[PDB]
Amino acid sequence: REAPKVLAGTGGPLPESFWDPAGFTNNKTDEELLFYRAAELKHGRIAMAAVVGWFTNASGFHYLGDLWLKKPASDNPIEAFNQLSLLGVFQMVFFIGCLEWLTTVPCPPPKDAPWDVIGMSDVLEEDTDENPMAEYKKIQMQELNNSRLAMVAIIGLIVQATTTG
Amino acid sequence: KIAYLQDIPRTIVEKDALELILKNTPKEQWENPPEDSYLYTVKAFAEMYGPGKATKMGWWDYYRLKMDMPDTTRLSSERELQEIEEYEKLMMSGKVPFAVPGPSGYFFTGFVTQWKGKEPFAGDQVITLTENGLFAKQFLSALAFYREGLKPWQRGLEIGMAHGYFLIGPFTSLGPLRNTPEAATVGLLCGCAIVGIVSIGGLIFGSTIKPTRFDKDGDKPGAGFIEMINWHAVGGLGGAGFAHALITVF
Amino acid sequence: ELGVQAPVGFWDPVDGNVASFRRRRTVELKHGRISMLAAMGYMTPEITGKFPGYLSPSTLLKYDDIPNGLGAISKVPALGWAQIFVYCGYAELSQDQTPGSPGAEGNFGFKVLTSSDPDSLEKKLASEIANGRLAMMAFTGMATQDGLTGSAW
Amino acid sequence: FESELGVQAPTGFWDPLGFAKDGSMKAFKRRRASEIKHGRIAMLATMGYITPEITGKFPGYLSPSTLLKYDDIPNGLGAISKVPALGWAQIFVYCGYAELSQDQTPGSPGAEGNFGFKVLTSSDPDSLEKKLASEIANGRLAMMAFTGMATQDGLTGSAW
Amino acid sequence: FAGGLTGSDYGGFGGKYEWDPVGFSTRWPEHLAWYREAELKHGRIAMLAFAGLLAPDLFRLPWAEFQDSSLDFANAHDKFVAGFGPMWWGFIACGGIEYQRFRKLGLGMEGLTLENAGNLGWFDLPKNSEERLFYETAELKNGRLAMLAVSGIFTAGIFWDQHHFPFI
Ligand code: CLA
Ligand code: CLA
Ligand code: KC1
Ligand SMILES: CC1=C(/C=C/C(C)=C/C=C/C(C)=C/C=C/C=C(C)/C=C/C=C(C)/C=C/C2=C(C)CCCC2(C)C)C(C)(C)CCC1
């Protein structure tokens, strides 16, 4: 593999199965593969929060949005987005814009691990041999596998909602 | 080998249970088990009951013996012993298996954060994620108080703008005149007053402690801090006025 | 080698290489398998009937209400054929041709060839591809029959 | 870059807006891959309108469950709402693979318009540039023809 | 693990599974012959049981006492055994077959070992030596599945009152 070894033992059904049934990674360089993972984790981390946000909003808990609209917004998260006051949406975009600015320009993640937006690499070990720790690779699997599931899950929610209610 | 650990009857203790005891017990304690250690009872009985010794016991004595020996389930297995022998090694090596408090407890995050800092005996150099992580370090360094290349008046102006813009809100809303037709000029005045009071406090600090980390070379000590505080007052005025202007216009 | 047959040679009046033939071979075997599944698959809603039944999504106790060779739909089993389409993709993305080192070898999960009866190479590999070619024409000819010449039988 | 397959003859290096004063060497191939892909789609798109006009609509049923004789679906804009979303999904899926096939990632053989069709592979008779330049030039014509055709079908109302 | 028994090996994404998470093999190694014999005989009967519940729904035996409706899988047992009936015809038949197994392995089943277990000697389809290994695992994997399947069939069918192939 050579370059895909930098993201090795971190995907597939079982943790050490480089899936890629399209050749999207072969012939690509090490930095490109790392950047591809940075896109994957960022999508998945947002997808995990997106699914959680979808469920806490599709059950009837839209306080900020019921207290701002002075009426219980519809449970359907897609329809509740329209009812949500335009001031709320613009502030929501701005807050994420500040976070995206903050991570990129002032506090950039490293170039070898462009997904360390919190930056554990300066205090983490990741290469020791203890059992009651050094399971960081396993928790990387749980983040990726859960996030990948959340990505297809949230799309299913949006596609079904926008079509078959 | 050790005398009393040979040819011990299975009735006194089973073979697998005895091996588990010997594994759990440290090697140096086999010869003379201490006291109150299952191996101590094994020695004190296997030296009385065996092939060449008393081969029978009263039913009650055997019943009490069977309740002094381990029941094959209260002993740590090899993997548990490895868990302990490696957890203690991590803890003594200055590395902590990272854990995060939860609902009356903590979840192990499966990460080895090196705990002791560069000065291992220093108490405030124990590196944590929230202060010594890459994001935390770059966020603290990029604050107006710490940002490289900023003139002292620029730091003061930025901090003052933030403070003045924020301080208007708590007064213009839920204030004594929160329901009056103006209800915001009062908040503007109160926010400017708070900015002035904290600026006066900063001037007291700079004329008493006199920090010299912002002074350029060959200047009156504390001049950089005083300039920062004066421009914080100016920035607080500006931010308060800007927040008031936004509230009135919009 | 492999699918070279007996009644004809390389039958290439148009690939004719190594790497390009390998990809074409993967297409050939793949199309062969589906036709054989489809050909025997089409004869079954015929004699033995529209065998299905049991509690299905919007098709509870559906006796395979998708009639005719095309299957039609109308929320009858053919909508459930999309589940066949989806799960067909799962096998097409897990046991696929990108890690399929030979032409169309899936590592023989069933191990039918581990002396259960099929054999490696020789006639069996040639018999699979030749049978696939016959079924592909048969399935296409069966498609013409349903369209403008009645039904299958 | 001033010597690729795009410079035909009637116009030279036609970059009035200066995308090449800063166009990196890989950016050319990326934009060339965009141009080749755009042109090939336009040729397929154009055929897809002029051919159902002269040749009648498909003899068939399109959707075996929702009575689409291909005649209730007009040739032009508005057919997007007439063709089923699944027939739309299935063409989306088919086009989805055609790029999730052998990769067109930067530097890959798929990134310069090469995919393995080889319908017209002349035996290198100084014609590899001819077929390449013709495909690019026709794609440029097809894109312009389509946009006019799209405006023809829209502004008039239907077809042409 | 468990002698050379073929329960593990050729068992999924991993080559070998070796699922004995109580130690009933290591704790009782003298019974690995008995356990295989029981495991196989359970699988074969369960497979005939599941394929059973379905076929009476279409064809019925010409015994002319079984040739009656309403004999589903919740009443066929208590109905056929009479004041004797068809159930004794089946039980006597199972006695005839089971007696044959005694002759091959002795009265006390002393000849029962970890290689002859569940091997009555009926060899018509199998060929070669590696296929026998492959088929033996294919036997068990089908057999173990049907043992859980008929278990779900019997419980779900009689609890939810299904009594037919969907068993729902
Ligand atoms: C934002 C999407 C995204 C991105 C950028 C990545 C990126 C990556 N994945 Mg990944 N993955 C994702 C989503 C994503 N993933 C989801 C949702 C799943 C669940 C099925 C997976 C499951 C998965 C496995 C099982 C494995 C990877 C692996 C990898 C790495 C190898 C590169 C690769 O596979 O192609 C990178 C490029 C892409 C993924 C392109 C995105 C997809 C294109 C645009 C077409 C898809 C469009 C789609 C058909 C239509 C959208 C709707 C759809 C939901 C129906 C790379 C870091 C491998 C790895 O690192 O293991 C060591 C590996 O084994 N992924
Ligand atoms: C997707 C469209 C597209 C793209 C990506 C390219 C890309 C390219 N062309 Mg190209 N071309 C196109 C369409 C396109 N072309 C069309 C339609 C024509 C016919 C007029 C041409 C004619 C042409 C010639 C004659 C030559 C090129 C060349 C080139 C290459 C270098 C020039 C460059 O950087 O162009 C970059 C192109 C773009 C960035 C496209 C931007 C288009 C802008 C945004 C809009 C233009 C107006 C538009 C028609 C408005 C439509 C109205 C609508 C809103 C209603 C590059 C690979 C040259 C070459 O190969 O050099 C070696 C060369 O000699 N092209
Ligand atoms: C929730 C209930 C449950 C079911 C229903 C189930 C089902 C099957 N498991 Mg399974 N399993 C767990 C639970 C369940 N498993 C758990 C908690 C663990 C963690 C200890 C675990 C681990 C393994 C491993 C390591 C293997 C394995 C196997 C199979 C197998 C055989 C298929 C085939 O070979 O025919 C089938 C049908 C083998 C394998 O082949 O998996 C495909 C094998 O190697 N399992
Ligand atoms: C809640 C939240 C949070 C926090 C946030 C914050 C903290 C915010 C802040 C904010 C702020 C705090 C802002 C501020 C701003 C300010 C401004 C914007 C200002 C401006 C000013 C100006 C502009 C001025 C000017 C002037 C001067 C300088 C002087 C003269 C006069 C004048 C006026 C000209 C977190 C993240 C934790 C999480 C969750 C969410």
mmCIF file with all atom_site columns, N, CA and C in Angstrom, chain C residues 63-98:
data_model
loop_
_atom_site.group_PDB
_atom_site.id
_atom_site.type_symbol
_atom_site.label_atom_id
_atom_site.label_alt_id
_atom_site.label_comp_id
_atom_site.label_asym_id
_atom_site.label_entity_id
_atom_site.label_seq_id
_atom_site.pdbx_PDB_ins_code
_atom_site.Cartn_x
_atom_site.Cartn_y
_atom_site.Cartn_z
_atom_site.occupancy
_atom_site.B_iso_or_equiv
_atom_site.pdbx_formal_charge
_atom_site.auth_seq_id
_atom_site.auth_comp_id
_atom_site.auth_asym_id
_atom_site.auth_atom_id
_atom_site.pdbx_PDB_model_num
ATOM 1   N N  . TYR C 1 63 ? -48.101 -13.321 -1.803  1.00 0.00 ? 63 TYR C N  1
ATOM 2   C CA . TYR C 1 63 ? -47.783 -14.482 -2.621  1.00 0.00 ? 63 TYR C CA 1
ATOM 3   C C  . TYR C 1 63 ? -47.091 -14.036 -3.901  1.00 0.00 ? 63 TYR C C  1
ATOM 4   N N  . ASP C 1 64 ? -46.046 -13.222 -3.758  1.00 0.00 ? 64 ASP C N  1
ATOM 5   C CA . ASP C 1 64 ? -45.283 -12.682 -4.881  1.00 0.00 ? 64 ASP C CA 1
ATOM 6   C C  . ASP C 1 64 ? -46.212 -12.040 -5.912  1.00 0.00 ? 64 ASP C C  1
ATOM 7   N N  . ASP C 1 65 ? -46.922 -11.007 -5.459  1.00 0.00 ? 65 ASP C N  1
ATOM 8   C CA . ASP C 1 65 ? -47.928 -10.349 -6.284  1.00 0.00 ? 65 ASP C CA 1
ATOM 9   C C  . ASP C 1 65 ? -47.337 -9.602  -7.473  1.00 0.00 ? 65 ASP C C  1
ATOM 10  N N  . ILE C 1 66 ? -46.025 -9.648  -7.676  1.00 0.00 ? 66 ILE C N  1
ATOM 11  C CA . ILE C 1 66 ? -45.416 -9.063  -8.867  1.00 0.00 ? 66 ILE C CA 1
ATOM 12  C C  . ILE C 1 66 ? -45.549 -10.078 -9.994  1.00 0.00 ? 66 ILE C C  1
ATOM 13  N N  . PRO C 1 67 ? -46.531 -9.933  -10.873 1.00 0.00 ? 67 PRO C N  1
ATOM 14  C CA . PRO C 1 67 ? -46.740 -10.919 -11.933 1.00 0.00 ? 67 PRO C CA 1
ATOM 15  C C  . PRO C 1 67 ? -45.995 -10.534 -13.207 1.00 0.00 ? 67 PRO C C  1
ATOM 16  N N  . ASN C 1 68 ? -46.051 -11.447 -14.181 1.00 0.00 ? 68 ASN C N  1
ATOM 17  C CA . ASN C 1 68 ? -45.458 -11.268 -15.506 1.00 0.00 ? 68 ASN C CA 1
ATOM 18  C C  . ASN C 1 68 ? -43.934 -11.279 -15.448 1.00 0.00 ? 68 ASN C C  1
ATOM 19  N N  . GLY C 1 69 ? -43.295 -11.464 -16.607 1.00 0.00 ? 69 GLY C N  1
ATOM 20  C CA . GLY C 1 69 ? -41.845 -11.562 -16.637 1.00 0.00 ? 69 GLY C CA 1
ATOM 21  C C  . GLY C 1 69 ? -41.154 -10.286 -16.194 1.00 0.00 ? 69 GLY C C  1
ATOM 22  N N  . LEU C 1 70 ? -41.716 -9.132  -16.560 1.00 0.00 ? 70 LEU C N  1
ATOM 23  C CA . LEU C 1 70 ? -41.127 -7.865  -16.136 1.00 0.00 ? 70 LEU C CA 1
ATOM 24  C C  . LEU C 1 70 ? -41.320 -7.628  -14.646 1.00 0.00 ? 70 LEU C C  1
ATOM 25  N N  . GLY C 1 71 ? -42.326 -8.261  -14.045 1.00 0.00 ? 71 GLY C N  1
ATOM 26  C CA . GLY C 1 71 ? -42.619 -8.095  -12.644 1.00 0.00 ? 71 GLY C CA 1
ATOM 27  C C  . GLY C 1 71 ? -43.519 -6.921  -12.317 1.00 0.00 ? 71 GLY C C  1
ATOM 28  N N  . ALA C 1 72 ? -43.589 -5.922  -13.199 1.00 0.00 ? 72 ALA C N  1
ATOM 29  C CA . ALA C 1 72 ? -44.364 -4.690  -12.993 1.00 0.00 ? 72 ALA C CA 1
ATOM 30  C C  . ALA C 1 72 ? -43.966 -4.112  -11.636 1.00 0.00 ? 72 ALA C C  1
ATOM 31  N N  . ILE C 1 73 ? -44.913 -3.658  -10.812 1.00 0.00 ? 73 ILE C N  1
ATOM 32  C CA . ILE C 1 73 ? -44.631 -3.170  -9.466  1.00 0.00 ? 73 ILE C CA 1
ATOM 33  C C  . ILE C 1 73 ? -45.946 -2.992  -8.722  1.00 0.00 ? 73 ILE C C  1
ATOM 34  N N  . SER C 1 74 ? -46.452 -1.758  -8.691  1.00 0.00 ? 74 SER C N  1
ATOM 35  C CA . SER C 1 74 ? -47.693 -1.426  -7.988  1.00 0.00 ? 74 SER C CA 1
ATOM 36  C C  . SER C 1 74 ? -47.626 -1.850  -6.523  1.00 0.00 ? 74 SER C C  1
ATOM 37  N N  . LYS C 1 75 ? -46.476 -1.590  -5.893  1.00 0.00 ? 75 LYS C N  1
ATOM 38  C CA . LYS C 1 75 ? -46.241 -1.916  -4.484  1.00 0.00 ? 75 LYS C CA 1
ATOM 39  C C  . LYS C 1 75 ? -46.414 -3.411  -4.220  1.00 0.00 ? 75 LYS C C  1
ATOM 40  N N  . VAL C 1 76 ? -46.066 -4.227  -5.209  1.00 0.00 ? 76 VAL C N  1
ATOM 41  C CA . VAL C 1 76 ? -46.180 -5.679  -5.091  1.00 0.00 ? 76 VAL C CA 1
ATOM 42  C C  . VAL C 1 76 ? -44.810 -6.309  -5.315  1.00 0.00 ? 76 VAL C C  1
ATOM 43  N N  . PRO C 1 77 ? -44.097 -6.705  -4.241  1.00 0.00 ? 77 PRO C N  1
ATOM 44  C CA . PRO C 1 77 ? -42.837 -7.462  -4.382  1.00 0.00 ? 77 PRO C CA 1
ATOM 45  C C  . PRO C 1 77 ? -41.753 -6.796  -5.223  1.00 0.00 ? 77 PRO C C  1
ATOM 46  N N  . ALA C 1 78 ? -42.122 -6.142  -6.327  1.00 0.00 ? 78 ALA C N  1
ATOM 47  C CA . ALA C 1 78 ? -41.125 -5.456  -7.142  1.00 0.00 ? 78 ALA C CA 1
ATOM 48  C C  . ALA C 1 78 ? -40.508 -4.287  -6.386  1.00 0.00 ? 78 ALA C C  1
ATOM 49  N N  . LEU C 1 79 ? -41.294 -3.617  -5.542  1.00 0.00 ? 79 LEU C N  1
ATOM 50  C CA . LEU C 1 79 ? -40.712 -2.651  -4.617  1.00 0.00 ? 79 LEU C CA 1
ATOM 51  C C  . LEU C 1 79 ? -39.759 -3.343  -3.654  1.00 0.00 ? 79 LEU C C  1
ATOM 52  N N  . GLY C 1 80 ? -40.075 -4.580  -3.269  1.00 0.00 ? 80 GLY C N  1
ATOM 53  C CA . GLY C 1 80 ? -39.147 -5.382  -2.494  1.00 0.00 ? 80 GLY C CA 1
ATOM 54  C C  . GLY C 1 80 ? -37.958 -5.872  -3.290  1.00 0.00 ? 80 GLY C C  1
ATOM 55  N N  . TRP C 1 81 ? -38.070 -5.902  -4.621  1.00 0.00 ? 81 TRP C N  1
ATOM 56  C CA . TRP C 1 81 ? -36.911 -6.220  -5.445  1.00 0.00 ? 81 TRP C CA 1
ATOM 57  C C  . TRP C 1 81 ? -35.828 -5.162  -5.301  1.00 0.00 ? 81 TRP C C  1
ATOM 58  N N  . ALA C 1 82 ? -36.202 -3.949  -4.888  1.00 0.00 ? 82 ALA C N  1
ATOM 59  C CA . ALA C 1 82 ? -35.200 -2.938  -4.578  1.00 0.00 ? 82 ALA C CA 1
ATOM 60  C C  . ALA C 1 82 ? -34.327 -3.369  -3.410  1.00 0.00 ? 82 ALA C C  1
ATOM 61  N N  . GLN C 1 83 ? -34.906 -4.067  -2.429  1.00 0.00 ? 83 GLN C N  1
ATOM 62  C CA . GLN C 1 83 ? -34.096 -4.649  -1.363  1.00 0.00 ? 83 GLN C CA 1
ATOM 63  C C  . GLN C 1 83 ? -33.125 -5.678  -1.920  1.00 0.00 ? 83 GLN C C  1
ATOM 64  N N  . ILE C 1 84 ? -33.569 -6.467  -2.902  1.00 0.00 ? 84 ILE C N  1
ATOM 65  C CA . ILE C 1 84 ? -32.644 -7.341  -3.613  1.00 0.00 ? 84 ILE C CA 1
ATOM 66  C C  . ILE C 1 84 ? -31.553 -6.513  -4.273  1.00 0.00 ? 84 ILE C C  1
ATOM 67  N N  . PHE C 1 85 ? -31.934 -5.380  -4.870  1.00 0.00 ? 85 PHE C N  1
ATOM 68  C CA . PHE C 1 85 ? -30.953 -4.507  -5.505  1.00 0.00 ? 85 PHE C CA 1
ATOM 69  C C  . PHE C 1 85 ? -29.966 -3.955  -4.482  1.00 0.00 ? 85 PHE C C  1
ATOM 70  N N  . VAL C 1 86 ? -30.462 -3.562  -3.306  1.00 0.00 ? 86 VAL C N  1
ATOM 71  C CA . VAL C 1 86 ? -29.592 -2.993  -2.280  1.00 0.00 ? 86 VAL C CA 1
ATOM 72  C C  . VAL C 1 86 ? -28.641 -4.053  -1.735  1.00 0.00 ? 86 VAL C C  1
ATOM 73  N N  . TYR C 1 87 ? -29.173 -5.224  -1.383  1.00 0.00 ? 87 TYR C N  1
ATOM 74  C CA . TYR C 1 87 ? -28.328 -6.268  -0.814  1.00 0.00 ? 87 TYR C CA 1
ATOM 75  C C  . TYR C 1 87 ? -27.416 -6.884  -1.865  1.00 0.00 ? 87 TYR C C  1
ATOM 76  N N  . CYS C 1 88 ? -27.807 -6.818  -3.139  1.00 0.00 ? 88 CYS C N  1
ATOM 77  C CA . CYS C 1 88 ? -26.893 -7.205  -4.207  1.00 0.00 ? 88 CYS C CA 1
ATOM 78  C C  . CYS C 1 88 ? -25.677 -6.289  -4.229  1.00 0.00 ? 88 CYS C C  1
ATOM 79  N N  . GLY C 1 89 ? -25.884 -5.001  -3.949  1.00 0.00 ? 89 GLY C N  1
ATOM 80  C CA . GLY C 1 89 ? -24.764 -4.079  -3.871  1.00 0.00 ? 89 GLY C CA 1
ATOM 81  C C  . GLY C 1 89 ? -23.843 -4.369  -2.702  1.00 0.00 ? 89 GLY C C  1
ATOM 82  N N  . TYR C 1 90 ? -24.409 -4.813  -1.576  1.00 0.00 ? 90 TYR C N  1
ATOM 83  C CA . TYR C 1 90 ? -23.589 -5.121  -0.409  1.00 0.00 ? 90 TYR C CA 1
ATOM 84  C C  . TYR C 1 90 ? -22.584 -6.222  -0.719  1.00 0.00 ? 90 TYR C C  1
ATOM 85  N N  . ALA C 1 91 ? -23.029 -7.282  -1.396  1.00 0.00 ? 91 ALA C N  1
ATOM 86  C CA . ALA C 1 91 ? -22.096 -8.306  -1.848  1.00 0.00 ? 91 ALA C CA 1
ATOM 87  C C  . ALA C 1 91 ? -21.178 -7.776  -2.941  1.00 0.00 ? 91 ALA C C  1
ATOM 88  N N  . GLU C 1 92 ? -21.637 -6.782  -3.702  1.00 0.00 ? 92 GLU C N  1
ATOM 89  C CA . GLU C 1 92 ? -20.831 -6.180  -4.757  1.00 0.00 ? 92 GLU C CA 1
ATOM 90  C C  . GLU C 1 92 ? -19.830 -5.166  -4.231  1.00 0.00 ? 92 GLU C C  1
ATOM 91  N N  . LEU C 1 93 ? -19.951 -4.750  -2.972  1.00 0.00 ? 93 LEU C N  1
ATOM 92  C CA . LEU C 1 93 ? -18.997 -3.837  -2.363  1.00 0.00 ? 93 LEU C CA 1
ATOM 93  C C  . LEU C 1 93 ? -18.154 -4.496  -1.280  1.00 0.00 ? 93 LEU C C  1
ATOM 94  N N  . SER C 1 94 ? -18.535 -5.688  -0.820  1.00 0.00 ? 94 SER C N  1
ATOM 95  C CA . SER C 1 94 ? -17.744 -6.452  0.139   1.00 0.00 ? 94 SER C CA 1
ATOM 96  C C  . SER C 1 94 ? -16.941 -7.551  -0.549  1.00 0.00 ? 94 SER C C  1
ATOM 97  N N  . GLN C 1 95 ? -17.618 -8.443  -1.272  1.00 0.00 ? 95 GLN C N  1
ATOM 98  C CA . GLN C 1 95 ? -16.957 -9.493  -2.044  1.00 0.00 ? 95 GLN C CA 1
ATOM 99  C C  . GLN C 1 95 ? -16.990 -9.072  -3.511  1.00 0.00 ? 95 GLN C C  1
ATOM 100 N N  . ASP C 1 96 ? -16.029 -8.233  -3.882  1.00 0.00 ? 96 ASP C N  1
ATOM 101 C CA . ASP C 1 96 ? -16.048 -7.502  -5.141  1.00 0.00 ? 96 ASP C CA 1
ATOM 102 C C  . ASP C 1 96 ? -14.820 -7.843  -5.988  1.00 0.00 ? 96 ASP C C  1
ATOM 103 N N  . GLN C 1 97 ? -14.663 -7.108  -7.092  1.00 0.00 ? 97 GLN C N  1
ATOM 104 C CA . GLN C 1 97 ? -13.591 -7.358  -8.044  1.00 0.00 ? 97 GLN C CA 1
ATOM 105 C C  . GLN C 1 97 ? -12.326 -6.557  -7.768  1.00 0.00 ? 97 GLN C C  1
ATOM 106 N N  . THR C 1 98 ? -12.410 -5.465  -7.009  1.00 0.00 ? 98 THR C N  1
ATOM 107 C CA . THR C 1 98 ? -11.193 -4.756  -6.624  1.00 0.00 ? 98 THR C CA 1
ATOM 108 C C  . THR C 1 98 ? -10.250 -5.623  -5.794  1.00 0.00 ? 98 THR C C  1
#
